[PDB]
From a paper:
Glutaminase catalyzes the first step of glutamine metabolism, converting glutamine to glutamate, which enters the tricarboxylic acid cycle. In human, glutaminase is encoded by two different genes, GLS1 and GLS2.1 GLS1 can be alternatively spliced into kidney glutaminase A (KGA) and highly active glutaminase isoform C (GAC)1. Glutaminase, especially the GAC isoform, is highly overexpressed in various cancers for the utilization of glutamine. It has been observed that GAC can form active filaments both in vitro and in vivo.
Cryo-EM samples of GAC containing Pi and an analog of glutamine, 6-Diazo-5-oxo-L-norleucine (DON) were prepared. GAC forms filaments with tetramers as the helical unit. By viewing the filament from the top, the twist angle of ~51° can be observed. A GAC tetramer contains four Pi binding sites, which are located on the dimer–dimer interface, consisting of R317 and K320 on the activation loop (AL), as well as R387, Y394′ and K398′ on the dimer–dimer interface. Significant conformational changes were observed in the GAC tetramer bound with Pi when comparing the tetramers in filament to free tetramers, and the RMSD between them is greater than 2 Å. Second, the AL (residues 308–334) of each protomer in the GAC-PF tetramer is reshaped and stabilized. However, in the GAC-PF tetramer, the B-factor analysis of our models shows that the AL is in a stable state.
Author numbering:
A (entry chain A), B (entry chain C), C (entry chain D), D (entry chain B): 138 to 532
Amino acid sequence: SLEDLLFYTIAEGQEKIPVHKFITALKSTGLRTSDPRLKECMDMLRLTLQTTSDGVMLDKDLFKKCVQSNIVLLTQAFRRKFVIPDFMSFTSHIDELYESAKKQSGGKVADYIPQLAKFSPDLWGVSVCTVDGQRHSTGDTKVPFCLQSCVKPLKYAIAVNDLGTEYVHRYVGKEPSGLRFNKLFLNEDDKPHNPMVNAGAIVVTSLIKQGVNNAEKFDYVMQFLNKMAGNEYVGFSNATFQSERESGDRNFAIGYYLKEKKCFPEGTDMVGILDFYFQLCSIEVTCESASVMAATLANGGFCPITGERVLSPEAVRNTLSLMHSCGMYDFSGQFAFHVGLPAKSGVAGGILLVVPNVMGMMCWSPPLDKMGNSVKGIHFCHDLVSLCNFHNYDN
Amino acid sequence: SLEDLLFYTIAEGQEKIPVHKFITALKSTGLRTSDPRLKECMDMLRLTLQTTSDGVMLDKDLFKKCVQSNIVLLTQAFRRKFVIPDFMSFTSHIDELYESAKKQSGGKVADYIPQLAKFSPDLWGVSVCTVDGQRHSTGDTKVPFCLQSCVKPLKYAIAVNDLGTEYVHRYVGKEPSGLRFNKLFLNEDDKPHNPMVNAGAIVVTSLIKQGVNNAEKFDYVMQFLNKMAGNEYVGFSNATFQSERESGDRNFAIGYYLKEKKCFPEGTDMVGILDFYFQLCSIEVTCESASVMAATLANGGFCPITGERVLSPEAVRNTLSLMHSCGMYDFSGQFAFHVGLPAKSGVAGGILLVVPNVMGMMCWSPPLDKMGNSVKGIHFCHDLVSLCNFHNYDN
Amino acid sequence: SLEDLLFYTIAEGQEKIPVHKFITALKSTGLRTSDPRLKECMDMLRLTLQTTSDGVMLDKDLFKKCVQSNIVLLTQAFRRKFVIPDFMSFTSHIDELYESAKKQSGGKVADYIPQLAKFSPDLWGVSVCTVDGQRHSTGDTKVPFCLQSCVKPLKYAIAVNDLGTEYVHRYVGKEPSGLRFNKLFLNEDDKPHNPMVNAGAIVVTSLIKQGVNNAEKFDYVMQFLNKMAGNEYVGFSNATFQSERESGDRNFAIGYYLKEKKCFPEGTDMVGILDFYFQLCSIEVTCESASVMAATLANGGFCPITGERVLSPEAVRNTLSLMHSCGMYDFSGQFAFHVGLPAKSGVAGGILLVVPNVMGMMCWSPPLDKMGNSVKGIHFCHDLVSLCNFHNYDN
Amino acid sequence: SLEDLLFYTIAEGQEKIPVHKFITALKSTGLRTSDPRLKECMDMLRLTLQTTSDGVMLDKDLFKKCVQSNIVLLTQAFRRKFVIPDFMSFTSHIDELYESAKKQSGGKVADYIPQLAKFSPDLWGVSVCTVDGQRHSTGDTKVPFCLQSCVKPLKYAIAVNDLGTEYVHRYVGKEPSGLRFNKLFLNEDDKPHNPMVNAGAIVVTSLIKQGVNNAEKFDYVMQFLNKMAGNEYVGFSNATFQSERESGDRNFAIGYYLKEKKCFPEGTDMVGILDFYFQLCSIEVTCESASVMAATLANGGFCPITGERVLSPEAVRNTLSLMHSCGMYDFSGQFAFHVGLPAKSGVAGGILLVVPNVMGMMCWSPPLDKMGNSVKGIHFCHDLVSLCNFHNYDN
């Protein structure tokens, strides 16, 4: 049987296979022991560890019993049929590029708010999660930090998912603006250029769950994010929220400018929308969570590590079409010239990279360059591209 | 042997295979009898037709003798190992979208020069050539017309190929401008935004074959185009050249603006460069030739139907990175929002589409919309995308 | 004596002069019987009318007694030594131009707020007050209406008067912007272009009476206006204030944009400043009052009909230097091309004209042209200039 | 008689008046012995000096005979009825401000052409000519230099004089642009913003003497200038012309941009117009000549020191209306904020100031500030204004 073949493959001319050997073999591929799809499996393993004082041998019966629950993924993992059969070498490349980026330095930690002028210019972490389930971490992959501007794609995806492409783009545009992200101006028919610049994001946040009050909207968006992050750590930075809402005069200017030109749906309180925008900008994340959200955007709109649907394919396709052409603002043309990937960046450090049909990635470094892009993150991106050949127009 | 297997496959329980049957079978796949790689083959067939008064039977020997010369491609063609195993159904889809675009109409034939105000608003043709050798035509696929603006990618590719990415982009920029293609303004460090807008193309044409006189430059570029078109019809529209050079005040303004800011290499005659630019804009093409050039840009920088190298991979990669983000100018964001492909358009009708690693395409229709894009061409592009799922961020 | 000479001049070979004859003669010149400088005089006349049942004759004594109080102005008025010796003919010209402007029509009454979409497109009034004391009215010269944008020069004058030119212009610029009045952008060193565009006025309103709360600021500015209007009707349009503060999204956008770039003094509440700005924009006026304020701006910074000082000469000079070059916004160049005068215009109808060293004028008409300038007001201005030769560069 | 009264006034209780005493007395007022209106007079004086070996006494007859010819101006000059009765004190003020400006220094002599990178950064001269005939000089008031940009008002005046305001302004605009003088962009209805920016001047030079060839146009304009300069030194800088025509890429860009949008009259050769523009820009002048041309612009369109008519009043009025609002380009708002006068400036050093109804002035200094305005010239202008109170909105 297939289970017997798997048992023989795990073993090497032996009778019994210890549990720890199987756990190490499973973790070798890239999947984590905490994977929800494997939950039942591990539970049974615990039921096996409750009897023996130390160690247990699984020859024929117990192994089959533990592997019986949802025996689909294990066959693929041990048969190397995922999108990246070898994750151990790509991980080594992550480590090499990580050290290489660490060697460089020199920027200016954002100080427009005190909570941002609080991180030492030394935190530098990376996390990656494949569309299939593999995950890797290196460094500060559990420290908290605000998403800041990494959430705008997530706003757009949800809005067009709820309403659909046609209704939404009656309100925001479709084109790169060619200028900075915080510039006050609209396209030819007095509409936001795209939902990645701040004005487009401010108009977009007003299409989500219209009518109900901000508490219900935040509950809705947090629910969507939690099933986007795959039930990972998505939090709230109340200190950062309080700082941002007081140092966000540019966003208030953009919001009133939009409201004046009738860029909003019928019957909207603009100020509540701005407060909601700041709330979403103030969602704390760890490179693990932001990487998982990236992979969700990358996969199909589904979540990678839960086998779940979160967005309609049109929403995700449009979000990537907008991230590739506006993800890095007026620098995007250069980024896609060298990197050729959809990516987003937050002033609080952090780059969210999507390799469509491959993986998602988040890499965090507080100190900023003059553009607003973490030096080590940009360096990691360029080196990753040079060594892995991930440009969208590579051969 | 392999030849015997091919002969049996062609035959149906018979002894001899007539020549016409084999010719029809070969043309069925998509390859043309005039393919250079098959030249020798067809020559031998003619040597076979010089003996018999009418018809000849090839059982074992003559078929093997004719197929011996370069027996690599035939095995793939009869084994359906190309990039599009079935070209007969895609051709039917081309026909359907062709008729659908023909049904629509309504524009304004360009009249800024008389030679353009000379085509009846009824010519509507399409041609496609796969990276492997397949070709299809429908309609006015041999009438002449000027490339106009479809040549700017071809200028950039050649320039960076001769000099390399690093030296060239010291002169032109890398970003979408966000405005029309004929606007006079440069990027932050007083450099052209990109080589697709007119200013970037005018600066780029001055990097090709520096020093020598315009006659030698035109011979050089025509040589490159001829081995880009695959030795197809690349001509010159002397009447159109004379009209354009007299109705090109915008390009002269851009050229002098560039020369003033020191956007040119050392020691360049600007006016000669502008005349050279108009000469390249005045290169006559038929949807066959422009399609072949598109497929060259699509393949690797190699020519599809000659197995030849014309450009370095860096040149082609950069040219596609610039066509996807500036190929349709300030409308490109919308085009890549719906079509998701590198494409270029000329005021003389004609859209050049590249499906990287798949094919190139040229579709010609004189009458223009307000943007400057042929109505039927734009409609064909959108319908092609909707029915074939060729968007770069499709699943 | 001088009084005897005046009495003989008033009389025509007679002994006694009736009071009504003298009153008519005085009103003929242009001065009003309610002039504060003449107050005492008229009071004595009333004391003379309390004795006789009807009519009283003033031969030598009573006339001298009544004229004794401040006998300076009367000598000039009866000696024709004012700036316009004949005010009866200029008044006829006002009437002619008034009817001529009335004949034309056709606009669009402002409807962005209901209080403005409340005047019938038929109100058309004019008032003029000379720097010396003469006043003329024609039509709706006592109906109320909001100043709207006619107050910005008055804000700038007061600000620079309190602080001085040097300190103030450290905050706002000095140049025409060349664009509309409600555009969001600053000059080269991120400062407002000038205090006439909305952004400059919003920054300027924050320099007046810094520190204290909005109630004290409004009391201060109303005091200044009342001694600017010459203790005429300066009111408040609470209904219009409530409408404006709810339909002023453009001004809120400008205000937040200014606050973001650090265009404000140290320690300012921006929102309170915006509310104060709307309060000043909502000050009701009648062509009499706005004309008197214009004449104040025209005279020296002094009030015309009270012999009082309200502004330092530097403040007034700078205010006129800014009204001539930015008073009508991006149309000002054309206005000064044909009219050659400092002028301001409000969306609520009303044009405030200053003929420096000559007079001030206010002309009210609700319906607007596409620019934002009342049709009849613009027509009156152009005709006034054509017939009176008041262009600043006339001979 | 009047002549006897003048003779007695010149004398001091004496019988005879020597010629040299009268010449000194005449030169004291400010008029020059070379004044054309006095020509005949001086001729007779020479006829008087041909008889006596040395010195001649004029008691009654010879003085009357010499003064008989056109005895109008002398009465005014000796009766102090000109516009500036005392020219000796204003001259002292010129000297004081001249030294004060000389004390400052520091710029960058223009080096875009070698002929401009040829003057030592030490030449500093001033000349003034009153509307009535007075003239004063201080320093390099006879060295040659090119007008450069001081000619654009002179082009506009002549164009609108020949054709009239209405026809001309169908081609150029009326508004300040708010940007630099060499920017490529047009107003709302695709027309030049005004005839002071380079584009407006290039369109304006094509309205003068249409149809005929460039030689006839240059003869026409030189004739007009010569009767504008009052038959003073107006020359041509052939070396500077040859340098400019080769370093004028910005003007060529502007010219082609204009021709493209149909901003020219019917049937014009654009390149000939550009060559004509450079020719007019290359007209050599000495502070004497440019001052005389300024005074012509200041007087009425008439020439000051010839009693001649050169321009229609509408032309001059419009030229001043455009110089006050666009004379110093994007700095004009600040200039009129502090100086309040029509003024023009050339990159070759030289400021041309008009005090309407008072005088014209030219002050030359090669080295430039960053704006393009000679440091010493700007300093002289500001100090002149501060000490003389010539601001247009002064009291």
